Amino acid sequence: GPQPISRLEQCGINANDVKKLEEAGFHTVEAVAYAPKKELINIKGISEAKADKILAEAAKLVQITTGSKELDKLLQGGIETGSITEMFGEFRTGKTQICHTLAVTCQLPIDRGGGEGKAMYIDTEGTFRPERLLAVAERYGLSGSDVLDNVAYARAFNTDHQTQLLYQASAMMVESRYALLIVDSATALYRTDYSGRGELSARQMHLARFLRMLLRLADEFGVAVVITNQVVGNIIAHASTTRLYLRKGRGETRICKIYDSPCLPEAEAMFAINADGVGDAKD
Amino acid sequence: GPQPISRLEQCGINANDVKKLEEAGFHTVEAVAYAPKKELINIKGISEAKADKILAEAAKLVQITTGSKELDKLLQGGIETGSITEMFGEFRTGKTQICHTLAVTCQLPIDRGGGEGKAMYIDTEGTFRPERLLAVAERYGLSGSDVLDNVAYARAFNTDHQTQLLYQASAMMVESRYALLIVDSATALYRTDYSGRGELSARQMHLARFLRMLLRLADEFGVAVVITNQVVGNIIAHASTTRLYLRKGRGETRICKIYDSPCLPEAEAMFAINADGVGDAKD
Amino acid sequence: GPQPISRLEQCGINANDVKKLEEAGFHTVEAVAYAPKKELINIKGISEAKADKILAEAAKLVQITTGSKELDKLLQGGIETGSITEMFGEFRTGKTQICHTLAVTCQLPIDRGGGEGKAMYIDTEGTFRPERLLAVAERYGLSGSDVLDNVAYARAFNTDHQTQLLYQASAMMVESRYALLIVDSATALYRTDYSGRGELSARQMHLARFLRMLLRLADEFGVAVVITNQVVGNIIAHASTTRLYLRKGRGETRICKIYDSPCLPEAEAMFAINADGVGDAKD
């Protein structure tokens, strides 16, 4: 399991540097331990000696239904909890709609295709609609009020705030059972904030660390990690376990394709976006 | 609510840098706080040390009827105040006419579908006509003189002046209740001023900051933000909540289509442009 | 009103740079003030430091009858003084004839549809005919000699000379009341002078500055600004308030159409070109 980074402070790292590591997004001794010097050195106010002391002392201690049956079959029954699933597609393909649907379906009983856990929606694009969550809840006969009470929401204004919310998510996810973490327009802040060309490596490093934190949180809490990508990077490939390509069919009916999964076939399924739901295509 | 940036000077930022931030368009501690270093560094006469001092001390503190029934039905009753609604369409489709109509309808009672608030028209294209406001006021039986007395008007000559007017708008909108802010040819000054190709990133940055200021003012005063775009940007998508495509039907009758809304359907409504009003199509 | 640029020199801009700004065509503190840095930097013999000093110190201080009744009805009574009215049409449609007629009608009493002011004809195409002015004066019973005495004429040899004449026009228009400024083949010199493709942005910038100077003079003196364009720029659309499309009807009778006006309908009116006058069609 995890080894929360608090224990690293008893090794004699000072607590301020541990706070800087938590701000960076390292929350376990496992997390600090299996990384090279440069990760800790790149943090502001950390020299090579402090990074070597951290690594040295760290080595001492150490299926959610989509609600579309065709899509569930495409996924062999739904998202695997504990792993990151990326859905990349054009704008208006229904990524946000799928997120809203899953934010409620996660709360469904496991026998009903849920995870019996609360949902987490981190929004960067303003598209969060509690009324859509209410619609999905009424679709499955779930209490809309309890759905909104079991979904904690916060809009990230920048990449630093986007990573900082993970610090609150890790501590908050310990007290209550969650099953779904949603990050909508996850890549948008890396394009709007970091727009220059010399700063590309900085946003790539921040994204890499963010993805590693996502995988860490997935393995730590056994929750589903959902991130949304606008396709107007090869780094996500090794990190994402299931890549879904979304494209528009005219009207409100969307085509979904699987474009990489080591376990799931590359395959396609047709679905629609209905007021209640993300739901099977009904010609 | 807001945390006006004035309090930041008591943290020990010098007042000249606070004046530079207000000129830049940051008016709350919230506004400075959730932005990265580069925003403050890019401002003229601000080094990285002053930006770091600002961010560090900042972290310590921190439905308007359109008067066309068919259009109201399309919007489910009218614009949501507190959010940006973008109407993109060809020239001569009636964007300016809609602006003139809304500038008066905003003052209508909330039961008559207004906001019971004053209007703000920032013009960049010269198309401001008080007589059109008088016609809309007499249409809804509002005093045309009081409508013009409750509409403050100023023509922006450039992008810098366009952003500078927001500083007067934020302080002026505190003393009186407003419900509608209109920015007509909002993108025209970014094309006339920034006409080169190497300066495209500069106009994109200025537009991004301007849009963020619009969102900030919308969340601060709970007013409706209306901006007009000529379609002869993808940045507006995450920022705009409702995208409307306007196209001409021959004669004076115009077709309206919804092209993105996370909550509103993609749908169309037919309307006309009448001397009194922007008003439903009447074959 | 205006704030003539002379006061800017007392702010401590050196006088040579003020002379360069006046040659460039900036004549008021308002004019220097509401423009971005690149306008002043692009002027020859002006560095970035002088432009920043100018903008900084500048911020411290800051219906004429057409004589065709049908056309008057089309315009709701005639040109609005203080604004630019553009008439775009093919060659030989009568743009120049309308200019000659207005050059005299402007001197008519206000009760007769005039402005009771002198006329200004800036010619670039050689088509200036004092005898046409005499014919219009005798039609409406105005003294032809006094009409020629109230019309100041000058032929622009190039785009730079065309803009330079505005410097003499601004100072000369202060001593006497004028009501009409005519620029005939206003776009021809930007085609004959700037004929290359790499120099397109230069002529577009010069035209933009020229149009801004026109708007400045219009707001300063409350005169009508008339420019003629041969259609064998999109920038003029936002700047021009009323666009009129002129096309030939065979013989000497011309069709006029309104192609944009926020206040005037899209509509057409038939008129003729008569020896005395630009005058209504009389089948």
C266: number of CA atoms within 13 Å, CB side? 12
After what residue numbers is chain A broken, C–N > 2.5 angstroms? 62, 232
- Say whether B91 counts as a known binding-site residue: yes
CA dist B115 and C199 (Å) reads 51
Nearest Cα of chain B lies from the Cα of C239 at a distance, in angstroms, of: 6
Contact status, residue A159 vs residue A203, Cβ threshold 8 Å: yes
**Residues facing B181 on adjacent strands:** B120, B225
Which chain C residue has its CA at the smallest distance from B203's CA? C36
**Inter-chain CB proximity B126 and C260 less than 8 Å:** no
- Cβ–Cβ pairs < 8 A, chains A and B: 38
Q: Which amino acid is at C97?
A: Q
Pairing status of strand B118-123 against strand B84-89: unpaired
- Smallest CA-to-CA distance from B165 within B150, B151, B152 is with B152
Q: Which amino acid is at B268?
A: E
Write the CB contacts of A144 (distance below 8 Å, at least 6 apart in sequence): A133, A134, A135, A137, A138
Q: Give partners of B (≥3 CB pairs < 8 A).
A: A, C
| Torsion angle of C-alpha atoms B112, B118, B124, B127, degrees rounded to 10 | 50
Nearest Cα of chain C lies from the Cα of B251 at a distance, in angstroms, of: 9
Look at residue B35 and give its three-state secondary structure. Answer: coil
Residue with tokens 């002529």: C203
Using a CB-CB cut-off of 8 Å, the residues of chain C touching B193 are 36
Nearest CB partner across the interface for B262, out of A127, A160, A195: A127
**Inter-chain CB proximity A131 and B263 less than 8 Å:** yes
Contact status, residue C226 vs residue C87, Cβ threshold 8 Å: yes
Chain A 98-157, residues with CB within 8 Å of chain B CB atoms:
124-129, 131-132, 157
Nearest CB partner across the interface for C235, out of B132, B158, B192: B192
Q: Which amino acid is at B93?
A: T
Q: Which amino acid is at C111?
A: D
CA dist A143 and B145 (Å) reads 51
CA dist C272 and C85 (Å) reads 20
Residue of A190, A192, A248, A276 best to disrupt the B interface, most CBs of B under 10 A? A192
CA dist C231 and C187 (Å) reads 9
The tokens for C182 are 């005519």
For B86, phi then psi, to 5°, come to -100, 130
Nearest Cα of chain A lies from the Cα of B107 at a distance, in angstroms, of: 27
Which chain C residue has its CA at the smallest distance from B158's CA? C35
**Inter-chain CB proximity C204 and B195 less than 8 Å:** yes
Which chain B residue has its CA at the smallest distance from A196's CA? B201
- Smallest CA-to-CA distance from C256 within C273, C243, C244, C240 is with C244
Contact status, residue C214 vs residue C165, Cβ threshold 8 Å: no
Nearest Cα of chain B lies from the Cα of A62 at a distance, in angstroms, of: 34
Write the CB contacts of A2 (distance below 8 Å, at least 6 apart in sequence): A27, A28, A30, A216, A219, A220
Instruction: Tell me, yes or no, if B253 comes closer than 8 A to chain C by beta carbon.
Output: no
Nearest CB partner across the interface for C260, out of B92, B129, B185: B92
Using a CB-CB cut-off of 8 Å, the residues of chain B touching C239 are 126
Contact status, residue C219 vs residue C176, Cβ threshold 8 Å: no
The tokens for A207 are 């994204």
- Say whether B89 counts as a known binding-site residue: yes
**C/A touch flag: 3 or more CB pairs below 8 Å:** no
Q: What angle do CA A209, A214, A217 make, to 5 degrees?
A: 120
The tokens for C154 are 């000058």
Contact status, residue A123 vs residue A155, Cβ threshold 8 Å: yes
CA dist A175 and A2 (Å) reads 15
**Inter-chain CB proximity B188 and C238 less than 8 Å:** yes
Write the CB contacts of C70 (distance below 8 Å, at least 6 apart in sequence): C269, C270, C271, C280, C281
- Smallest CA-to-CA distance from A13 within A35, A29, A36 is with A29
Resolution limit, Å: 3.7
Which chain B residue has its CA at the smallest distance from A44's CA? B52
Write the CB contacts of C164 (distance below 8 Å, at least 6 apart in sequence): C23
Which chain B residue has its CA at the smallest distance from C258's CA? B92
Nearest Cα of chain B lies from the Cα of A73 at a distance, in angstroms, of: 27
The tokens for B264 are 């509103």
Pairing status of strand C84-89 against strand C242-248: parallel
Is A109 buried (19+), middle (13-18) or exposed (0-12) by CB count in 10 A?
A: exposed
- Say whether C96 counts as a known binding-site residue: yes
- CA A191 to each of CA A224, A244, C150: distance values in angstroms, whole numbers, following the listed order: 25, 21, 61
Helix ranges (H only) for chain B are 6-10, 15-24, 29-33, 37-41, 48-61, 69-74, 95-105, 130-139, 144-149, 159-175, 188-192, 200-221, 235-239
Residue with tokens 């060309």: A197
Instruction: Tell me, yes or no, if C198 comes closer than 8 A to chain B by beta carbon.
Output: no
Residue with tokens 């959610």: A64
- Residue A252 has a CB neighbour count (10 Å cut-off) of 15
| Torsion angle of C-alpha atoms A7, A13, A19, A23, degrees rounded to 10 | -90
- Residue C99 has a CB neighbour count (10 Å cut-off) of 24
Contact status, residue C41 vs residue C48, Cβ threshold 8 Å: yes
Residue with tokens 């020629």: C148
Which chain C residue has its CA at the smallest distance from B251's CA? C266
Nearest Cα of chain A lies from the Cα of B2 at a distance, in angstroms, of: 16
- Smallest CA-to-CA distance from A102 within A157, A32, A179, A24 is with A179
Nearest Cα of chain B lies from the Cα of C145 at a distance, in angstroms, of: 38
The tokens for C97 are 């004839």
Reduce the secondary structure of chain C to three states and give it as a string. Answer: CCCECHHHHHCCCCHHHHHHHHHHCCCEHHHHHCCCHHHHHHCCCCCHHHHHHHHHHHHHHCCECCCCHHHHHHCCCCECCCCEEEEEECCCCCHHHHHHHHHHHCCCCHHHCCCCCEEEEEECCCCCCHHHHHHHHHHCCCCHHHHHHCEEEEECCCHHHHHHHHHHHHHHHHHCCEEEEEEECCCHHHHHCCCCCCCHHHHHHHHHHHHHHHHHHHHHHCCEEEEEEECCCCHHHHHCCEEEEEEECCCCEEEEEEEECCCCCCCEEEEEECCCCEEECCC
- Say whether B96 counts as a known binding-site residue: yes
- Say whether C90 counts as a known binding-site residue: yes
Pairing status of strand B84-89 against strand B224-230: parallel
CA dist A74 and A78 (Å) reads 8
DSSP letter at B193 equals: T
- Smallest CA-to-CA distance from A223 within A29, A85, A21, A100 is with A85
Long-range contacts of residues C131-137, Cβ cutoff 8 Å, at least 24 apart: C132/C97, C132/C100, C132/C101, C133/C100, C133/C103, C133/C104, C135/C275, C135/C276, C135/C277, C136/C67, C136/C100, C136/C101, C136/C103, C136/C104, C136/C105, C136/C276, C136/C277, C136/C278, C137/C104
**Inter-chain CB proximity B35 and A195 less than 8 Å:** no
Instruction: Tell me, yes or no, if B219 comes closer than 8 A to chain A by beta carbon.
Output: no
**Residues facing B204 on adjacent strands:** none
- Smallest CA-to-CA distance from C24 within C163, C208, C227, C177 is with C163
The tokens for A65 are 């239904």
- Smallest CA-to-CA distance from A140 within A239, A218, A238, A65 is with A65
The tokens for A45 are 């106010």
- The method recorded for this entry reads cryo-EM
Write the CB contacts of A210 (distance below 8 Å, at least 6 apart in sequence): A25, A162, A163, A166, A186
- CA C186 to each of CA A94, B64, B211, C272: distance values in angstroms, whole numbers, following the listed order: 52, 44, 37, 23
Look at residue B277 and give its three-state secondary structure. Answer: coil
- CA C101 to each of CA C98, C129, C139, C146, C231: distance values in angstroms, whole numbers, following the listed order: 5, 11, 10, 15, 22
Residue of B44, B124, B125, B190 best to disrupt the C interface, most CBs of C under 10 A? B125
In DSSP notation, chain A reads ---BTHHHHHTT--HHHHHHHHHHT--BHHHHHSS-HHHHHTSTT--HHHHHHHHHHHHHH--B--S-HHHHHHTTSSBPTTSEEEEEE-TTSSHHHHHHHHHHHTTS-GGGT--SSEEEEEESSS---HHHHHHHHHHTT--HHHHHHTEEEEE--SHHHHHHHHHHHHHHHHHS-EEEEEEETTTHHHHHT--SSTTHHHHHHHHHHHHHHHHHHHHHH--EEEEEEE---HHHHHH-SEEEEEEEPSSSEEEEEEEE-SSSPS-EEEEEE-SS-EEE---
CA dist C38 and C19 (Å) reads 18
Contact status, residue B44 vs residue B90, Cβ threshold 8 Å: no
Using a CB-CB cut-off of 8 Å, the residues of chain A touching B235 are 192
Which chain B residue has its CA at the smallest distance from A93's CA? B260
Using a CB-CB cut-off of 8 Å, the residues of chain A touching B34 are 157-158, 161
Contact status, residue A11 vs residue A61, Cβ threshold 8 Å: yes
- CA C277 to each of CA A114, B218, C105, C280, C281: distance values in angstroms, whole numbers, following the listed order: 84, 56, 10, 9, 11
- Say whether B93 counts as a known binding-site residue: yes
CA dist A92 and A275 (Å) reads 15
- Say whether C94 counts as a known binding-site residue: yes
Q: Give the end-to-end CA distance of chain A in Å, rounded to a whole number.
A: 47
Using a CB-CB cut-off of 8 Å, the residues of chain A touching B237 are 91
- Cβ–Cβ pairs < 8 A, chains B and C: 40
CA dist B256 and B267 (Å) reads 8
**Inter-chain CB proximity B34 and A252 less than 8 Å:** no
Which chain B residue has its CA at the smallest distance from C59's CA? B161
Instruction: Tell me, yes or no, if B38 comes closer than 8 A to chain A by beta carbon.
Output: yes
Longest dimension (CA), chain B: 65
Q: Give the end-to-end CA distance of chain C in Å, rounded to a whole number.
A: 47
**What kind and span of H or E run contains B227?**
strand B224-230
- Smallest CA-to-CA distance from A67 within A144, A160, A158, A133 is with A133
Helix %, strand %, coil % for chain B, to 5? 45, 20, 35
The tokens for A280 are 């099977």
Which chain B residue has its CA at the smallest distance from C212's CA? B157
- Smallest CA-to-CA distance from B108 within B75, B152, B145, B63 is with B63
CA dist B221 and B234 (Å) reads 26
Return the axis-axis angle of helices B15-24 and B48-61, rounded to nearest 10°.
90
- Say whether A90 counts as a known binding-site residue: yes
**Inter-chain CB proximity A92 and B238 less than 8 Å:** no
**Residues facing A153 on adjacent strands:** A121
